[PDB]
Design a binder for this molecule. Structure first.
Ligand SMILES: Cc1cn([C@@]23C[C@H](O)[C@@H](CO)[C@@H]2C3)c(=O)[nH]c1=O
Ligand SMILES: Cc1cn([C@@]23C[C@H](O)[C@@H](CO)[C@@H]2C3)c(=O)[nH]c1=O
Lengths: 313, 307
């Protein structure tokens, strides 16, 4: 069977991920590498109206005390469902085609983001921003789809000062607090994958939090530097101080989904061509999979092109 | 490996699903009850009250369809969390299809109640967008072997009498919602048969507009998605929504549906449910320790979230 290479470029907005991705794709044949863009049209029109504007306006109104935390949470939660729908549905139809882990791939699919961006990362950052409840973040976590073999995720690194300078270009609003929260969440994500792959057991180390980044290299991180640290919220604890079981099971799901992912870090503090070639070099050490049927390649290729045409900006 | 029989008791609220299941369970059979405590306290405060109050406010014109939908959507996430997390942790223990089972797990509802049925009913009540409904559909967990779902049958008037008796804390007696949820579950049963008999929604889609043996597509859940919000200016369904329907079809086709007549006494309902198990599909578990782990999960869920 032909082989497939799936690469999800993710991380905070504003680093140059979208450009880097298209430049990489521009290098190959329009036949053997396909780009799956951010579903901007779904967010602005198809799924709901101007969802990005809605998210930023909602946080703004909350910050100004014009609406309550409760009002903000219902709006953010619904907005986040809209944000992740194209990702979830694409993952669901792609799933049956992915075989086991496995010369160049017959096909390379480069995605602008993985489902965890909308089902975990942005929801967790909004929780830190006070516009989402930790229970809702964990409900999204419990719904993250099974991690398919060959899930390569490239997260980005960029000094905060450079990031802030880039970000400030312009339904978005310049929110440095949100920028800090999303950078922190993705940093914790990278550490969480490393923690799990180094054999870390959150249930075994939970008590190391009580007293208040590299994804594929380095020593095992402390649990306090992983995503697990975010769920020590009073809302999630029983009178006896322990986490309610319903939430503990959601963390078990988080561990299971992230532990099998192959994570890489891309340095975005360089020119667009530099980012492209650095990613290209990284792509060499990534895991390919076989596909399940002979026609899986053309089918997958058609799905990606249809997705891009219908939902890409 | 030992065998497991999973039975999900589902269908419209107010038929007596909970009462009947209880009388049924009363060591080789465990009951995962309605997670009322999660709904009223752990996940959020009085979610049921929130849901019915919101619809009521919408019906009275005190809030817009838009405001209602964001509330219903967020609330449905809270409602389905216990089912979703339970399915996710149970999944790795389920093996392939397989004497009596070593363990029989009876659940008060399946994840599709909160990720498909109630959202579809609220869409019909004007309080949820169809795009949100399809977003929940896209998140329905893969259907594992041995997914036996028991749905109920009960005449409308009788159902209304029981509904009046079975109101949950914060619930408002809403006959329009009762009709909507009864319609959705009826379409659900028809949809499973439609798919099992080879129906292809893409092939029959034209029948919704252009006017073996199986139900007409117009009598399946697919008909609900001919919603204009999901269509392009030329009337074609956007691909992103067509893909969600492809997911819907894949998830539902392999479920094994059984109809329980609730139009009888609690003891009768209980016995009928027991009668239905002979045709249910059992599976093996994946590890020697799966059974004990499953039991613990079920007991812990009940103790923590059951009423
Ligand atoms: C995936 C995803 C993105 N976003 C944001 C970040 C950026 O401003 C922009 C482009 O990614 C859009 C609003 C979000 O808020 N939630 C999400 O799940
Ligand atoms: C599963 C589920 C139930 N409900 C309702 C119907 C009944 O009033 C009660 C008991 O089932 C509770 C509020 C709902 O609204 N959404 C859902 O996903």
């Amino acid at each position: 069977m032909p082989t497939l290479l799936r690469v999800y470029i993710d991380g905070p907005h504003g680093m140059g991920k979208t450009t880097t991705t298209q430049l990489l794709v521009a290098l190959g044949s329009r036949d053997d590498i396909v780009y799956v863009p951010e579903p901007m049209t779904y967010w602005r029109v198809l799924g709901a109206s101007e969802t990005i504007a809605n998210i930023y306006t909602t946080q703004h109104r909350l910050d100004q005390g014009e609406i309550s935390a409760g009002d903000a949470a219902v709006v953010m939660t619904s907005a986040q469902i809209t944000m992740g729908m194209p990702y979830a549905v694409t993952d669901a139809v792609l799933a049956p085609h992915i075989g086991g882990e496995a010369p160049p791939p017959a096909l390379t699919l480069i995605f602008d983001r993985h489902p965890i961006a909308a089902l975990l990362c942005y929801p967790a950052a909004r929780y830190l921003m006070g516009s989402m409840t930790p229970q809702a973040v964990l409900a999204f976590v419990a719904l993250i789809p099974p991690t398919l073999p060959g899930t390569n995720i490239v997260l980005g690194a960029l000094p905060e000062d450079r990031h802030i300078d880039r970000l400030a270009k312009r339904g978005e609003r310049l929110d440095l607090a949100m920028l800090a929260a999303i950078r922190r969440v993705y940093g914790l994500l990278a550490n969480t994958v490393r923690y799990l792959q180094c054999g870390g057991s959150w249930r075994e180390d939970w008590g190391q939090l009580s007293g208040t980044p590299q994804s594929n290299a380095g020593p095992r991180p402390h649990i306090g530097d992983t995503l697990f640290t975010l769920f020590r919220a009073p809302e999630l604890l029983a009178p006896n101080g322990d986490l309610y079981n319903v939430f503990a099971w959601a963390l078990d799901v988080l561990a299971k989904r992230l532990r099998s992912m192959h994570v890489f870090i891309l340095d975005y503090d360089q020119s667009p061509a530099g980012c492209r070639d650095a990613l290209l070099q990284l792509t060499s050490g990534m895991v390919q999979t076989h596909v399940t049927t002979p026609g899986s390649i053309p089918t997958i290729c058609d799905l990606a092109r249809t997705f891009a045409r219908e939902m890409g900006e």
